[PDB]
UniProtKB/TrEMBL annotation, chain A:
<feature type="domain" description="Capsid protein VP4 dicistrovirus">
    <location>
        <begin position="3"/>
        <end position="58"/>
    </location>
</feature>
<protein>
    <submittedName>
        <fullName>Structural polyprotein</fullName>
    </submittedName>
</protein>
Automatic annotation (TrEMBL), chains E, F:
<feature type="domain" description="Picornavirus capsid">
    <location>
        <begin position="76"/>
        <end position="200"/>
    </location>
</feature>
<feature type="region of interest" description="Disordered">
    <location>
        <begin position="1"/>
        <end position="14"/>
    </location>
</feature>
<protein>
    <submittedName>
        <fullName>Structural polyprotein</fullName>
    </submittedName>
</protein>
<feature type="region of interest" description="Disordered">
    <location>
        <begin position="28"/>
        <end position="47"/>
    </location>
</feature>
Amino acid sequence: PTSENPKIGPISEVASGVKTAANGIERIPVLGEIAKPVTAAVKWFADIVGGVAAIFGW
Amino acid sequence: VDEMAIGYVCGNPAIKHVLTWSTTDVVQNPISNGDDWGGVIPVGMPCYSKTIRAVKGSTSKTEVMDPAPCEYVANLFSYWRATMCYRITVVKTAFHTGRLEIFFEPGSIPTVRTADNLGPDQTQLNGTIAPSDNNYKYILDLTNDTEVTIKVPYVSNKMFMKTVGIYGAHDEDNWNFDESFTGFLCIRPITKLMAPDTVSQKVSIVVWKWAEDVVVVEPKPLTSGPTQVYNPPAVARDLVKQIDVSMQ
Amino acid sequence: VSQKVSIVVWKWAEDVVVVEPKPLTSGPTQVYNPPAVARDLVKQIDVSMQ
Amino acid sequence: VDEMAIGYVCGNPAIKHVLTWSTTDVVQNPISNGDDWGGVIPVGMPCYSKTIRAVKGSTSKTEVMDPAPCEYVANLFSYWRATMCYRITVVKTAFHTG
Amino acid sequence: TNVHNTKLASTSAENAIEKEQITTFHDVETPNRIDTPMAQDTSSARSMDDTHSIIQFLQRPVLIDNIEIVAGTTADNNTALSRYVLDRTNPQKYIKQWTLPSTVLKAGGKAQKLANFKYLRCDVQVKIVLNANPFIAGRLYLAYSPYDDKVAPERRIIYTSRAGVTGYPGVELDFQLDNSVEMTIPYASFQEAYDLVSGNEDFVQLYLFTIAPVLGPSAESANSKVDLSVYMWLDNISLVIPTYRLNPNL
Amino acid sequence: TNVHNTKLASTSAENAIEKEQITTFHDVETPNRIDTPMAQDTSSARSMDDTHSIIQFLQRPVLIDNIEIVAGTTADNNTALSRYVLDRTNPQKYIKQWTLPSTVLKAGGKAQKLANFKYLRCDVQVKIVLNANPFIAGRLYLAYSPYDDKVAPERRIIYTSRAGVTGYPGVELDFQLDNSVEMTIPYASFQEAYDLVSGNEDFVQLYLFTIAPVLGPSAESANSKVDLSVYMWLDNISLVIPTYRLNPNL
Amino acid sequence: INLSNKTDENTISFFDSGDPERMNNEALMRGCGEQIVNLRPLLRTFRTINDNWSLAANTKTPITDLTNTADAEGRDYMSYLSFLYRFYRGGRRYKFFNTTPLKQSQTCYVRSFLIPRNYTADEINTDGPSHITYPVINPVHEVEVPFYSQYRKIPIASTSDKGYDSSLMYYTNVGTQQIVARAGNDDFTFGWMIGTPQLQGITKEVAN
Amino acid sequence: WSLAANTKTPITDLTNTADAEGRDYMSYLSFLYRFYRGGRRYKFFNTTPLKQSQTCYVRSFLIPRNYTADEINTDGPSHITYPVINPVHEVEVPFYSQYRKIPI
């Protein structure tokens, strides 16, 4: 994208995997718009499954 | 399903017209019987219909609107652009027959302007003053069929139209209403309603409204006041709530 | 024929460079708005900083 | 086209002199007839011409200028450097010579 | 040379001929034009719809007439088509007659587009939408007679028999079978084109006859009736030769 | 089945939708048409000329004005363009002014073709043919000012200087160099198309100024003069959306 | 003709027009500069529910005091869009801009705690996570409330249970005035769609 | 530019005056053109000489051009500053238009 700021936008954009115009009448799933299963996709659950030292207070 | 999507909300249809088509209604005359905007369907997302709730004690004259899910969303924004879709269903039997003219006229609507409201002028929409010959239309035969979905793509000399609509529209304030709609559909008979004496001498014309291909421009309303939901009071003597806008 | 001819002169610039974005004038840049009548006084813009 | 470019604005010509050249005008004498800077063309971007609008009631003596698109731009800046171009057209017939 | 927002006076090629649509300018030298540099289309009209032509405009259906025939009426619209016609004081009865192509040229704002044109060739397209509840019966015959107003009486669709009328080019129009009929009347002039200025002549008459009157219940009722609506437009069109004259009839 | 000159009543497909240009007929069953068998074009209109469209009709030059400036006249048409304008009671003098695009929509029978249409996008093409014997000299400036009637006075081509006027888009028009000038005024509306029904608004004014008055012999004579004729037409046209309404102004 | 009342499901679109997506985009690239495609973004924006909320000194004020009023008005997005749905989930964000006109104490501070919804301050402790600001150096609080719920979806209706999701307490050692703007966290969304209510427009008290 | 307390002041009040003067670039350069597009930026540096309230704050909203404050709601996107910690507002106005070009 064509910016003049060294930071193109405010946040980091996470992709989706949806395939519909977003303003259209066609019914679109909400699970494709964000994907946040019960996995290491969320930070804290990843920290638990990896048993990081912070979840123990270190 | 994502139910917060503008296409899922504005894609939920709602009944905005239920007209009565009698055997006496004249050809090339809008079907005015039954409802507050009889025959004339302002083509747009905003709300074109309102009623005035009066309470005496002087009178307060509160105005109430009839939004469809497409008109609820548009009210949150200033300008709109969309493709307006209308399912015009007729409640009849196998023994009612008739033709129905549904033509689109761009621009301003012929309005009878009231001190507190705004409605159509049925005298200026007859086949003599309003010939439907140079007009996009769909002649619907009611011999066996009942309905037709008419989609009106966005046509205007503006990239976006206003979302004000009927809000604060009256004899003095009528500009923002005209610049909130691309035109209007008028439902007129081409052939009087034929009906035996063994069935009803009148049919109902139900019209559902919804939008496609929607874009909304700025997240601020064009209204004099903020967005306010009408909470019906218990008794008719009761005054309605007004929200404090004093910033101090 | 006429005993006089007109000498029209058009003016324009090429190979232009301009140095600083501030005028050298005693006062700011002001466009002349012709008043209606010749008795009318012209507008003067307030330059008082307080 | 980019119409905000200094070369597009300063490249729009404008009439700053319309002089009258009569049969009586003397050789090697500037053609002074007709306009406020007769014969003399100050070579530069800035404006060289102004008139004084006087209004009495004492007098205020407001001065007004005649900018071309090149002189309108220069007034926004302090110093200028440019190549000045002048199309000197004569309104005549096939029977005027000189 | 390279100046903007102005075209200065200059010499040019010494023999110029610019042809706009029908006007042809000869100039001693090529005009000194100023056009817009790197022009754009800053509108949206080409995105809203297609730009219709005059041929398209004249192809638009126009509502000409709306008829309502009631049963149990000894009127010309309901009285049927007669086996014989022995005299002209007793001719065939019809529901409605149309002089063509006038009835279309004088309708739907078509005269506004035919104006400033001298010659026309067109076919007339007719569509009738009838509506009658399932308890009403009947049968009409839509036929066209060329030169009916200008041809001898013995040769007219009026003043002939039912078997003669129904020998004309037409469409049988039953209420419960054919709720709608279409008809193409060809270019009926004997000359190479319709004259839209001088000759206000009509060349084909369109008749709507009645084979069987409206058959409804014996009990008198406002519902034993049928409603008609006639649409007309042109087809196979050719407007060619301009002119400053107009027909005040249209 | 095979019968001629008639279409008998019959059943057909139970859901028919015929779309003519803009009208769309739904019928319970397919209409029972009668068309001409092995039809022909028995006219010659297609051989005489081409059938012009509305875009072509609107591209036809129309004579708008004929001006005649005489020398030795202190009239607004001959008095020249002034170095300064200090007051509005003393503005710049012009030969003729034109509100656009109205002056063209209301000319040459173009309103007849623009009728029954709601939106327009068009450029205005101007051609001036001047004629002046070889013994007359002079120089005019044809310029156009957008929103001149709606913009603040200080921003108008009227109420500005000669160097301001000649800073506008225009054509220098000398009598002995440029006997003819052309000009293309673009689509000047700020909105997506001209509204031909509701908004009778004009967006660009066309001015014909005088740099140098008519220079002719000292001896008074009826021959020391020039005659002008202004032609106008449209270009880059788009008529899109029909309507039953009309502007009574046109 | 067959005696029948049927639906053929016929659809007609007028005008021989171009692609609405392309034209809409062209329009937004000239008159908007953005394209709103969903209403959760409006639940992320912050909008005012009260532009002056006065409080008493040394008083723990649950913000339900204010949001029970605001949710019925329809002035903010979290209220206007709540009339289209029945359920909601996720946390909420509140911003309190100081507008206190008078000086009460040398050191004014704002403090916020958690509280189960529909509880009173006399029913809950001032423990747990808190956030403290000083309106003189930071006149904006910017606290956030997580979704600490017993249920995966909260109804906008009433319930038998109470204190099943978290809310906010607001404490000021002095009488302060606030611009109260709220929004949803990056997980807030509303439930499943229903019909619209009526809208309230202009009121014109006329002399009779 | 002095203002009154608890008063919503449209900046047209000031820009209608300024555009005719020719003092700023957005006005001087507007006399060369007829159309414009795009948004605008405004900076408000505080020069208030007197103290009225313990807590002074500046707030800015959107408004359609040539409207009055009595014709518009105080909703939509806003920006608030406190002149004592931040004496410069630095708000920006987008091009929220029905038209692709606005005439002067």
